[PDB]
Copies of this chain bind each other. A is one copy, B any other.
């Protein structure tokens, strides 16, 4: 069934699909610690709005030139587009966790991101700062160590997935370096 999700992602147009309980068990047999993995993905997407805005503002917080006149987050329209880019990256990381394979992140998101930003003039060194913030954000939620929110989960250890998401974030920086 995971191929069907891949067929949804790759089809080059808006498309939807879902998992039923019968087919869900096929996924549960296929995945290693699927109980943890699905809870982990929920922990990101359930707070993705909080994560992205803080990281982009955190980038602005340490680098105030980005909001100075002519800056790439100056005037509303550039500011929204940066938030948009943060979301898309974070979403593509989330599916990479769900599939447990980094291919979709590279082939659909990271490919051409280097060439794209330079032609747009996006400062890539600061883009790394925002992504590296989300990696700090994402690890805390999966380990349920966030300061201002604690989640409800069945007891147990989620260390491996926390390391797994870490590699996916680090792929982003290397592509745009």
Binding site for B on A (CB under 8 A): 13-18, 124-125, 128-129, 167, 170-171, 173-174, 176-177
A13 in contact with B170 (CB, 8 Å) = no
Name the distance in Å between A96's Cβ and chain B's nearest Cβ. Answer: 14
Name the distance in Å between A20's Cβ and chain B's nearest Cβ. Answer: 9
B174 in contact with A17 (CB, 8 Å) = yes
B167 in contact with A14 (CB, 8 Å) = no
Q: Bound complex: CA of A173 vs CA of B177, how far in Å?
A: 34
**Nearest 5 Cβ contacts at the A-B interface:** A16-B173, A14-B128, A14-B125, A15-B177, A18-B170
A171 in contact with B18 (CB, 8 Å) = yes
Known pairs A14-B125, A16-B170, A18-B171 / 12 extra A-B pairs, C-beta < 8 Å: A13-B124, A14-B124, A14-B128, A15-B128, A15-B177, A16-B176, A16-B177, A17-B174, A17-B177, A18-B167, A18-B170, A18-B174
Q: What are 6 A-B interface contacts by the 8 Å CB criterion?
A: A13-B124, A14-B124, A14-B177, A16-B128, A16-B173, A16-B177
